[PDB]
Design a protein around this nucleic acid. Structure first.
Ligand SMILES: [K+]
Ligand SMILES: [Mg+2]
Ligand SMILES: [Mg+2]
Ligand SMILES: [Mg+2]
Ligand SMILES: [Mg+2]
Ligand SMILES: [Mg+2]
Ligand SMILES: [Mg+2]
Ligand SMILES: [Mg+2]
Ligand SMILES: [Mg+2]
Ligand SMILES: [Mg+2]
Ligand SMILES: [Mg+2]
Ligand SMILES: [Mg+2]
Ligand SMILES: [Mg+2]
Ligand SMILES: [Mg+2]
Ligand SMILES: [Mg+2]
Ligand SMILES: [Mg+2]
Ligand SMILES: [Mg+2]
Ligand SMILES: [Mg+2]
Ligand SMILES: [Mg+2]
Ligand SMILES: [Mg+2]
Ligand SMILES: [Mg+2]
Ligand SMILES: [Mg+2]
Ligand SMILES: [Mg+2]
Ligand SMILES: [Mg+2]
Ligand SMILES: [Mg+2]
Ligand SMILES: [Mg+2]
Ligand SMILES: [Mg+2]
Ligand SMILES: [Mg+2]
Ligand SMILES: [Mg+2]
Ligand SMILES: [Mg+2]
Ligand SMILES: [Mg+2]
Ligand SMILES: [Mg+2]
Ligand SMILES: [Mg+2]
Ligand SMILES: [Mg+2]
Lengths: 135, 96, 86, 97, 52, 99
RNA sequence: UGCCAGCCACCGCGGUCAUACGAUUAACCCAAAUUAAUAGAUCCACGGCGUAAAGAGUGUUUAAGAAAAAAAAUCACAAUAGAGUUAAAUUAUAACUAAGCUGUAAAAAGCCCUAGUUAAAAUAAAAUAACCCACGAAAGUGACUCUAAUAAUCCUGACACACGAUAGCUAGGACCCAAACUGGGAUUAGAUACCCCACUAUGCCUAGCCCUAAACCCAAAUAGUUACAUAACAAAACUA
C-alpha cells in the first residue's frame, strides 16, 4: 500500500523506490511535478542534536560603521525629539540625518572625532532641529 | 533553531534576520509547485494552528475554492482516514 | 502485532506489515553492494559480499528475511545480544 | 565589491557594567561608620549579598574588616553602635510593615 | 630545597612541607640525571660546586 | 535591482539601534474593554491599558506614541533547551498622536 | 500405575483421564552396528571498568614507555605548621528573692547542696557573613593577629618513599559539655531497645602507634572533538 517510515528518506525517495519495486502501480500525480521541479534541499529527516563543547554558531552580527556613529549620538543626546516611524519605508530619522551629515563632513579631510561631532551638531542646529544635550 | 542557521542572513542586536534572497528562491519554487498541483485538479489543504489568523486563513481557502483546517487537529485524521472521515476518502495531494 | 488470541495476532501483524516497506538495493540482484558492519543498540551484526556460487550462509532469522527481499548470496555473523526484534 | 555587507566589529552599544556601591573605594577596619551600615541594628548580624548588594570582592573584604574590628575593640558585636544609627540607609531590607 | 630544610628543622610535625621537600629532591634528582646524559662537563661542575 | 544588503542599511529598524528607550509611534488594530493591542511596526504587537484621561477617543486605527523597552519579551529558564517566547512586546503609553 | 514404582544431557514429568514411568500398536532415525561412560578436538577479552565482576584512599619517583600539529609558571577568599589573643553561651563561686526545680504524647525517677536575677575565671566549641565556592595531592580547612609557606619551563608510572577523617591503644596533662558501657524511671507479653535522669571511657593539649571507611563525585591520568550516534536508568556521546 505504501511506506510510512519518516526517517528512511524523503517522500520522493520512497515513492520512486516502491514504484520501481513493483508494489505501487498507480503513479501519484505530484511525482511528475517533483521530477521536473526539485527543491533546493531534499527533505531528509535529521535529528536535531544539541551542540556541546567549543563549537559555536556561524551567524554573524550585523554591525556597520554607521552604527558606531549612532552609538555616540545616542549616548550624548539620547533619543532625538523626532518620533521614529516604522510604517514609512523611506523614513529619515534624526540620527540617520546626523550620520548622513557626519559622512559628508568627514569627506572634507577631518580626522578628529571631537571636531567631527561638534561641527555636525552645529550643522544640524543650522537646519532648525533640536539637539538638547542630555545631562 | 539549529537547522535555520543556513537560512539566516545574520543577527541584529540579538534579533535574527532572515535572508530574503534565499526566501525568494524558495518562494519561487513553492508558488510554482503549488500552481502545478492545482492545475492537475489536486486537493490543497491549508493548515495553521494559530489563533490570530484562523478566520483570515479560513476565508482565504473559501475564495480559492480549496480546503482549510485551522481548528484542533485530531490524532488519527491523516493516518487513520477511513475511520475519521468515511469509508472511501481521497487524501489531500498537497498541504500548506 | 499483539492481541489476546494467537489467531488474531497473526492477522494484525500481516496487515500492519505492508504499511512499513523498505526497498533494499541488490547489486545484480544476488548480493548487497558492499560489506556492511553495524551495531544496532546491543546487537553486532556483520555482513559480507559473496560471489554467485556461495549463497545464504547467515543466521536462520536473516536467511528468512533474505529470501523475502531477494538476496541469494550473503554471509552474516551476529555478535552480542540475539534478540529477534533488535 | 558590495560595501553594504556588515563588518566584523565589536558591539558599539555595550553599556558599561554596573559598579557596586564600594567599587574603587578602600574599605578599612578603622572607620566604624562604613562597616556599621551593613549590620542589622537590632541583632548585629551581617547582611548577605542579596541584601547588601555589594559585589563578590567588596563583600568578603567588608566581612573580614568587620570581624577584625570585633576583636580588636572598635565596634560592638551584638548590636549596632547607637551613635551611627542615623546614617543613610544602604541596605534593601525593611523591618517595619 | 635548602629553604625547606631550614623550615623542616623548626616545624618537625609539618607534613605538607615534608612532602614538598621530598618531591623537590626527586625533581632535582630527575633533572640531574637528564643533565648527566646530555652535558657531562656541566654536570660535573654543578655536582661539585653545590655539594650534591 | 536593489541588493538585499542595501535594504537593511537604510531600513528604519536598523537606524533605530537599541530598542530600549526609543519613542516610536504605533497604530491600534484591536480593542478590548481595557486592553489596547497596538502595532508599532515591529515583529509583534504590544499591549497597553487605556488611560483614565481621554479614554473615549482610543478607537480602532488611532495613532498613539510608545516608548519601546524590549522589542520582544523573551527569557531563559533552567531546564529549557529553547527560550520560551511571549509573542508580544513591551511598551508604555505617552499619550495620543498629535495630528 | 497414582509425587507410588520410576525417568532426564539442560528446562522438567508422576499427587486415579500421563503423547515424559512400565507394557502394547504405530512412527522416526542410524545400521553390522546402536546407545551409555570417561578423556580429547573446539570453546574466554583486539571484549569491558557510573548503576552489573572491574579505576585500586592520595601524591611524587625508579624500571619502562609516549612526544611527532599547535599551545600552556599561577594567584582577592576557609591550605598547612608554629606563637599570641577572645567575642556570644555555659560552669565553679558570692549576694538577693522565691518553694519548689528539671522532664514527657502522658508520667515516674532524679534534685530541693535547688531555681530566678546581678557579678564571674578555666576548659571546650567557632551564630549572622555563606543565596559566596576559594585553598590543598587526598583525607581535610571557613573566630582574630603575626611568622614561616603552597614541588616541576609547565606528559604516563609501581609492591619503592611520604601521607591518610573517625573509632581504638601506650604515657602525661586538661574536663565546661556531650556521651558507648552501667544504674534508676517509664513503656511492653518480655524491652538486657526507642523515650526520661545520673555518671565513666572518650571527644581536647603534648609525644608515639594503629593505616581502617558508602576513603563514593561509586565516573583513573594527560591531550583533545561535537563529528558518528539514543539498550535501560543516571551525571549526553567519543578518539589518541
Ligand atoms: K565564632
Ligand atoms: Mg539467548
Ligand atoms: Mg527412556
Ligand atoms: Mg490412565
Ligand atoms: Mg524425552
Ligand atoms: Mg514409554
Ligand atoms: Mg561493583
Ligand atoms: Mg562498578
Ligand atoms: Mg588507580
Ligand atoms: Mg596510586
Ligand atoms: Mg628515562
Ligand atoms: Mg600544633
Ligand atoms: Mg517524685
Ligand atoms: Mg544556681
Ligand atoms: Mg575548674
Ligand atoms: Mg563548600
Ligand atoms: Mg598535583
Ligand atoms: Mg602547585
Ligand atoms: Mg610521574
Ligand atoms: Mg588515622
Ligand atoms: Mg582519633
Ligand atoms: Mg583518640
Ligand atoms: Mg594492647
Ligand atoms: Mg590516656
Ligand atoms: Mg570525663
Ligand atoms: Mg553530663
Ligand atoms: Mg534499665
Ligand atoms: Mg569524603
Ligand atoms: Mg572505589
Ligand atoms: Mg578516585
Ligand atoms: Mg594513575
Ligand atoms: Mg600533574
Ligand atoms: Mg580532561
Ligand atoms: Mg522506553
Amino acid at each position: 500500500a505504501g511506506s510510512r517510515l519518516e526517517t528512511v528518506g524523503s517522500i520522493f525517495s520512497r515513492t520512486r523506490d516502491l514504484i520501481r519495486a513493483g508494489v505501487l502501480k498507480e503513479k501519484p500525480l505530484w511525482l511528475d511535478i517533483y521530477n521536473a521541479f526539485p527543491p533546493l534541499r531534499e527533505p531528509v529527516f535529521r535529528r536535531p542534536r544539541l551542540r556541546y563543547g567549543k563549537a559555536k554558531a556561524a551567524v554573524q552580527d550585523i554591525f556597520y560603521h554607521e552604527d558606531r556613529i549612532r552609538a555616540k549620538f545616542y549616548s550624548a543626546y539620547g533619543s532625538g525629539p523626532k518620533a521614529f516611524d516604522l510604517f514609512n519605508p523611506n523614513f529619515k530619522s534624526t540620527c540617520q540625518r546626523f550620520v548622513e551629515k557626519y559622512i559628508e563632513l568627514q569627506r572634507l579631510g577631518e580626522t578628529d572625532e571631537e571636531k567631527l561631532f561638534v561641527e555636525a551638531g552645529k550643522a544640524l542646529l543650522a537646519e532648525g532641529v533640536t539637539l538638547r544635550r542630555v545631562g | 533553531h539549529r537547522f535555520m542557521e543556513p537560512y539566516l542572513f545574520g543577527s541584529r542586536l540579538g534579533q535574527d534576520i532572515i535572508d530574503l534572497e534565499q526566501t525568494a528562491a524558495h518562494l519561487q519554487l513553492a508558488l510554482n509547485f503549488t500552481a502545478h498541483v492545482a492545475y492537475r485538479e489536486g486537493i490543497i489543504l491549508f493548515v495553521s494552528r494559530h489563533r490570530q489568523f484562523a478566520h483570515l486563513i479560513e476565508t482565504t481557502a473559501r475564495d480559492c475554492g480549496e480546503y482549510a483546517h485551522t481548528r484542533y487537529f485530531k490524532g488519527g485524521l491523516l493516518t487513520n482516514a477511513p475511520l475519521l472521515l468515511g469509508p472511501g476518502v481521497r487524501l489531500p495531494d498537497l498541504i500548506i | 502485532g499483539k492481541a489476546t488470541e494467537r489467531a488474531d495476532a497473526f492477522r494484525k501483524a500481516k496487515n500492519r506489515a505492508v504499511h512499513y516497506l523498505h526497498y533494499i538495493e541488490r547489486y545484480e540482484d544476488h548480493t548487497i553492494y558492499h560489506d556492511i558492519s553495524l551495531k544496532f543498540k546491543r546487537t553486532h551484526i556483520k555482513m559480507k559480499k559473496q560471489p554467485r556460487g556461495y549463497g545464504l550462509h547467515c543466521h536462520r532469522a536473516i536467511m528468512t528475511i533474505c529470501r523475502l527481499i531477494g538476496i541469494k548470496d550473503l554471509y552474516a555473523k551476529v555478535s552480542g545480544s540475539v534478540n529477534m526484534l533488535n | 565589491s558590495n560595501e553594504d555587507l556588515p563588518v566584523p566589529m565589536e558591539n558599539p552599544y555595550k553599556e558599561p557594567l554596573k559598579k557596586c556601591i564600594l567599587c574603587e573605594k578602600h574599605v578599612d577596619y578603622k572607620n566604624v561608620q562604613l562597616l556599621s551600615q551593613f549590620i542589622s541594628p537590632f541583632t548585629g548580624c551581617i547582611y548577605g549579598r542579596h541584601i547588601t548588594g555589594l559585589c563578590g570582592k567588596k563583600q568578603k573584604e567588608i566581612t573580614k574588616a568587620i570581624k577584625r574590628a570585633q576583636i580588636l575593640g572598635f565596634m560592638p558585636v551584638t548590636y549596632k553602635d547607637p551613635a551611627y544609627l542615623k546614617d543613610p540607609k544602604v541596605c534593601n531590607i525593611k523591618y517595619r510593615e | 630545597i635548602r629553604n625547606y630544610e631550614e623550615h623542616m628543622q623548626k616545624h618537625r610535625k609539618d607534613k605538607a612541607h615534608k612532602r614538598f621537600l621530598l618531591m623537590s629532591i626527586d625533581q632535582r634528582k630527575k633533572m640531574l640525571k637528564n643533565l648527566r646524559e646530555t652535558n657531562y662537563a656541566v654536570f660535573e661542575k654543578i655536582c661539585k660546586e653545590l655539594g650534591i | 535591482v536593489e541588493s538585499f544588503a542595501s535594504m537593511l542599511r537604510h531600513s528604519p529598524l536598523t537606524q533605530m539601534g537599541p530598542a530600549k528607550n526609543k519613542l516610536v509611534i504605533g497604530q491600534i488594530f484591536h480593542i478590548v474593554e481595557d486592553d489596547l493591542y497596538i502595532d508599532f511596526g515591529g515583529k509583534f504587537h504590544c499591549v497597553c491599558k487605556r488611560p483614565e484621561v481621554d479614554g473615549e477617543k482610543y478607537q480602532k486605527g488611532t495613532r498613539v506614541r510608545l516608548r519601546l523597552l524590549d522589542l520582544e519579551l523573551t527569557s531563559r529558564f533552567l531546564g529549557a533547551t529553547t527560550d520560551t517566547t511571549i509573542l508580544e512586546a513591551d511598551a508604555v503609553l505617552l499619550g495620543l498622536q498629535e495630528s
